[PDB]
Design a protein around this motif. Structure first.
Motif, PDB file in Angstrom:
ATOM      1  N   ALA A 289     -67.464  14.546 118.185  1.00  0.00           N
ATOM      2  CA  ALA A 289     -67.296  14.767 119.616  1.00  0.00           C
ATOM      3  C   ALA A 289     -66.949  13.471 120.335  1.00  0.00           C
ATOM      4  O   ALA A 289     -66.113  13.467 121.245  1.00  0.00           O
ATOM      5  N   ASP A 290     -67.577  12.361 119.934  1.00  0.00           N
ATOM      6  CA  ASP A 290     -67.307  11.072 120.564  1.00  0.00           C
ATOM      7  C   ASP A 290     -65.840  10.664 120.476  1.00  0.00           C
ATOM      8  O   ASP A 290     -65.384   9.875 121.311  1.00  0.00           O
ATOM      9  N   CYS A 291     -65.096  11.173 119.486  1.00  0.00           N
ATOM     10  CA  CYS A 291     -63.746  10.670 119.241  1.00  0.00           C
ATOM     11  C   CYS A 291     -62.794  10.975 120.389  1.00  0.00           C
ATOM     12  O   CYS A 291     -61.812  10.249 120.580  1.00  0.00           O
ATOM     13  N   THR A 292     -63.048  12.041 121.149  1.00  0.00           N
ATOM     14  CA  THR A 292     -62.245  12.360 122.323  1.00  0.00           C
ATOM     15  C   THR A 292     -63.039  12.195 123.612  1.00  0.00           C
ATOM     16  O   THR A 292     -62.635  12.708 124.658  1.00  0.00           O
ATOM     17  N   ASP A 293     -64.152  11.472 123.552  1.00  0.00           N
ATOM     18  CA  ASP A 293     -65.097  11.319 124.654  1.00  0.00           C
ATOM     19  C   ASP A 293     -64.997   9.878 125.141  1.00  0.00           C
ATOM     20  O   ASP A 293     -65.556   8.968 124.522  1.00  0.00           O
ATOM     21  N   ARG A 294     -64.303   9.677 126.265  1.00  0.00           N
ATOM     22  CA  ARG A 294     -63.991   8.320 126.704  1.00  0.00           C
ATOM     23  C   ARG A 294     -65.252   7.510 126.976  1.00  0.00           C
ATOM     24  O   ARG A 294     -65.322   6.324 126.628  1.00  0.00           O
ATOM     25  N   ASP A 295     -66.260   8.126 127.596  1.00  0.00           N
ATOM     26  CA  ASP A 295     -67.479   7.384 127.896  1.00  0.00           C
ATOM     27  C   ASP A 295     -68.211   6.984 126.619  1.00  0.00           C
ATOM     28  O   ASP A 295     -68.731   5.866 126.518  1.00  0.00           O
ATOM     29  N   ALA A 296     -68.253   7.874 125.626  1.00  0.00           N
ATOM     30  CA  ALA A 296     -68.861   7.506 124.351  1.00  0.00           C
ATOM     31  C   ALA A 296     -68.114   6.343 123.699  1.00  0.00           C
ATOM     32  O   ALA A 296     -68.735   5.402 123.187  1.00  0.00           O
ATOM     33  N   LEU A 297     -66.782   6.375 123.729  1.00  0.00           N
ATOM     34  CA  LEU A 297     -66.013   5.317 123.077  1.00  0.00           C
ATOM     35  C   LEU A 297     -66.127   3.987 123.815  1.00  0.00           C
ATOM     36  O   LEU A 297     -66.090   2.929 123.177  1.00  0.00           O
ATOM     37  N   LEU A 298     -66.253   4.012 125.147  1.00  0.00           N
ATOM     38  CA  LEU A 298     -66.529   2.780 125.878  1.00  0.00           C
ATOM     39  C   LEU A 298     -67.816   2.139 125.376  1.00  0.00           C
ATOM     40  O   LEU A 298     -67.867   0.931 125.120  1.00  0.00           O
ATOM     41  N   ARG A 299     -68.866   2.949 125.219  1.00  0.00           N
ATOM     42  CA  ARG A 299     -70.138   2.462 124.698  1.00  0.00           C
ATOM     43  C   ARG A 299     -69.960   1.784 123.343  1.00  0.00           C
ATOM     44  O   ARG A 299     -70.464   0.677 123.119  1.00  0.00           O
ATOM     45  N   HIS A 300     -69.236   2.437 122.424  1.00  0.00           N
ATOM     46  CA  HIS A 300     -69.011   1.848 121.105  1.00  0.00           C
ATOM     47  C   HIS A 300     -68.177   0.579 121.199  1.00  0.00           C
ATOM     48  O   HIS A 300     -68.450  -0.401 120.494  1.00  0.00           O
ATOM     49  N   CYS A 301     -67.137   0.588 122.042  1.00  0.00           N
ATOM     50  CA  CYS A 301     -66.299  -0.597 122.220  1.00  0.00           C
ATOM     51  C   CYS A 301     -67.115  -1.771 122.748  1.00  0.00           C
ATOM     52  O   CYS A 301     -67.007  -2.898 122.250  1.00  0.00           O
TER      53      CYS A 301
END
Ligand SMILES: N[C@@H](CCCC[NH3+])C(=O)O
Ligand SMILES: N[C@@H](CCCC[NH3+])C(=O)O
Ligand SMILES: [Cl-]
Ligand SMILES: [Cl-]
Lengths: 485, 479
Positions: A325-337
């Protein structure tokens, strides 16, 4: 030191001009050192007595690489384009020309005629009946590491093993053309100067046509011109030639580079991947005799079918804290970045963030040949959107030893979709993006005439040559790489 | 009325998107129209009954070029990269697809499957068992250069020119590769523009804060390879000229250059006429061609004619002594109404007279030889008269096709010639060469005596295809 040697060679040249024509051009060279070494390689059959008895006469010229003056007789070594050979010189045979030989310098270009023999240590040698100076060298050959590139003409002489890299480079490109020509692709030429730089995200060189008062761009890619030919009905085309990038000071990237681009109507990125691994593998076998190569310490095998791996799956494998789900979830990916120390801009959507994570955490691990597939639409302005999830495009990049070697996709032929993406790129350039694409109205117009569904491909020829020659540096596969003044 | 047609087609696309994926990409094309026409050209063997009975099934796609609706049955013509073929469509067989077909427009890209047949008029036809729309066209078909992508469609004859162009270059590479020349790539951006007398394009590398020039010729880089010991090299690629507005010339053009150590211009001329003749036989099947109304035969040995003797033949008022007398040549130029400049020596005045009175008469292939040193800054001077160089240009039908010479490998002579060029560049000559100290350095390491050559590939293709305009042999000429 060196300036003294040069002056001395000029004095030799001055005396040479007084004796006659110092730069003659009336010697017909007929025999090549490397061809003779191969023909007479069997020293058990071709002993000195056998070669002298055979009566073969040779007529050669080459650069004087070494001299051994023994007294009444001498040895010399010359190098032409094909290799080296010894010469045996006797004053009793050559007379005044032997006296001249004693005064020549390493670097001079000389011509020789005579029979063949073999030295006591087994070396093939010319028994010189006649010898003469063709070109006086004025600068001595060398006995920094950047001089091999600012003086390629010196390094080809004294590091003759580098010649083999450039010969193989030529055979690689020729093998690629034969592979494509045999599959009925038409090789075409498109302009190197464009009204609008398109087909790649790269900063261009700009120039001016003074008569027309017209700014022009050196091409960053031929892509948009090649698809105009697809529209025209040239349904299988390719082009191997230069692109130009006006970017930062790099020792690994040259501002000029060679790309093969190809377009095949009625193919998708599935068939283009098939083609890509097919031509790379077959060219490897043609020029190397097999599919294995050692590159930058890595042992690469091109034989097995290349891996095909989705970008989002590869990211998740190397980042287990990222869910599907995170892969298309911009807020999740910001967190990982943020967690990965990946600098992000506010204009980045989930797709750009996923690409950033891929670049930082995945691509250096792709050693054996791997197609990474299905790039987000946000970073794929010319690739056809996937029918089932239009947030992704049917796109790939090929990686070998952590390096991008090719990229291709099902082509976007929907003109309205293409115009929309062009408009989003124009919006991205306004935000401080020096690599965003421009709106090319004439290309939209070509698509409005109708382009067949098509698959397209770019192969980085310089990196392909680096891989197949085992060359770790771009500077070893370019005859004249750009060097800082 | 075209913008209304575009609106109707866009409305059709809107309905298409409502029904599904409007731009599908899931059709595997297998057959080509031009190859089927060849395979079944013998209509005596391949009657309608023999075609329908052999069970051949085809799977092809092409642009819809023509429609003929006859009620329950229709005919259509499509065009792919290889040619055209007719389609026969029966509503009783195709159902809803026939209804769709009647709505399709000329210019649409469609796919079809079926057997083969032949109409009463003897035309090979696909009996369509299945048909579908792959790409809706939004712009009606009617240019030739402003939109090559349109002219390749409606003037398919022009495709043969560009196919033959690719075969000419391929045959040239094979001829040279088979003679052990090595094909090389040298830079297209130069620090110093050299190798030709031509105004260059300039550009700027921002990060290095360094100005660069698009190459006018690769010549000086190729000869550095000769010094390095790559003794048989060639390159086929673009040069760039920032000249004036001209319909006959293109600012980008393709040249083959070659360098052979231990050749002179005599052997380079042998090579030049051999490769041209042999390439003509390979792509045309013989050595004759018709070009711009002239019948050219490449078969016989090319004429070799000195420039000064050709000038005197066409201008009998010009004596042998006149040919090296600047004031006499100035008088002849004025009488011939040739405008010239005070910096022109006898050698440049002789060239001006050659260009004005000789060049256009050279129909059959002719090497004009022994150019004055004044106009040949990279050519080896002649051993017996150093006012001339051992140089040639090849003319066919009055046009220059190739240029070559015994190469200047004397570094002190070359530096002096550069220094004269630099003086001219300061005298108001935008085409005078620059001093290239690194090239002189390479010659000081020593270059073998060498012969060199440039062939104008675009003009060679014009000749061998019978094309009278360069715009017909360039896919995207500058407009
Ligand atoms: N223009 C691409 C290559 C072709 C991509 C597929 N249309 C590049 O510069 O990498
Ligand atoms: N550089 C020449 C071709 C080679 C001439 C022999 N070195 C030209 O542009 O026409
Ligand atoms: Cl001399
Ligand atoms: Cl759609």
């Amino acid at each position: 030191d060196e300036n003294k040697l040069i002056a001395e060679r000029r004095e030799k040249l001055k005396a040479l001009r007084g004796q006659g024509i110092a730069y003659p051009n009336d010697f017909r060279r007929e025999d090549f050192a490397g061809r003779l070494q191969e023909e007479f390689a069997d020293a058990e059959t071709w002993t000195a007595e056998a070669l002298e008895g055979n009566g073969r006469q040779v007529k050669m010229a080459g650069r004087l690489m070494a001299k051994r003056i023994m007294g009444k007789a001498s040895f010399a070594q010359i190098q032409d384009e094909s290799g080296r050979i010894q010469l045996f010189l006797q004053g009793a045979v050559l007379g005044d020309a032997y006296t001249a030989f004693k005064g020549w310098d390493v670097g001079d270009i000389i011509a020789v005629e005579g029979g063949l023999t073999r030295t006591k240590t087994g070396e093939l040698s010319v028994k010189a009946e006649s010898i003469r100076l063709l070109t006086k060298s004025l600068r001595p050959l060398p006995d920094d590491v950047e001089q091999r590139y600012r003086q390629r003409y010196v390094d080809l002489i004294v590091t003759p093993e580098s010649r083999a890299v450039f010969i193989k480079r030529s055979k690689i490109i020729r093998a690629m053309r034969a592979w494509l020509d045999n599959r009925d692709f038409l090789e075409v030429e498109t302009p190197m100067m464009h009204y609008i730089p398109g087909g790649a995200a790269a900063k261009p060189f700009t120039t001016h046509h003074n008569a027309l008062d017209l700014d022009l761009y050196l091409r960053v890619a031929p892509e948009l011109y090649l698809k105009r030919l697809t529209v025209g009905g040239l349904e299988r085309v390719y082009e191997i030639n230069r692109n130009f990038r006006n970017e930062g000071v790099s020792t690994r990237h040259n501002p000029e580079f060679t790309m093969m681009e190809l377009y095949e109507a009625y193919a998708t990125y599935n068939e283009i991947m098939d083609l890509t691994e097919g031509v790379i593998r077959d060219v490897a076998k043609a020029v190397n005799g097999g599919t294995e190569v050692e590159w930058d310490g890595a042992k690469i095998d091109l034989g097995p079918a290349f891996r095909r791996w989705r970008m989002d799956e590869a990211v998740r494998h190397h980042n287990p804290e990222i869910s599907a789900a995170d892969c298309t979830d911009r807020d999740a990916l910001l967190r990982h970045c943020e967690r990965l120390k990946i600098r992000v801009k506010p204009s980045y959507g989930w797709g750009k963030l996923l690409l950033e994570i891929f670049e930082a955490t995945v691509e250096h691990t792709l050693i054996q040949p791997t197609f990474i597939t299905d790039h987000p639409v946000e970073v794929s302005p010319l690739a056809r959107a996937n029918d089932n999830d239009p947030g992704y495009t049917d796109r790939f990049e090929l990686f070998v030893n952590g390096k991008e070697l090719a990229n291709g996709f099902s082509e976007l032929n929907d003109p309205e979709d293409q115009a929309q993406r062009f408009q989003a790129q124009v919006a991205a350039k306004e935000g401080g993006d020096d690599e965003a694409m421009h709106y090319d109205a004439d290309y939209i117009r070509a698509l409005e005439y109708g382009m067949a569904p098509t698959g397209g491909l770019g192969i980085g020829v310089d990196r392909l040559v680096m891989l197949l020659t085992g060359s770790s540096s771009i500077r070893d596969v370019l005859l004249f790489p750009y060097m800082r003044p």
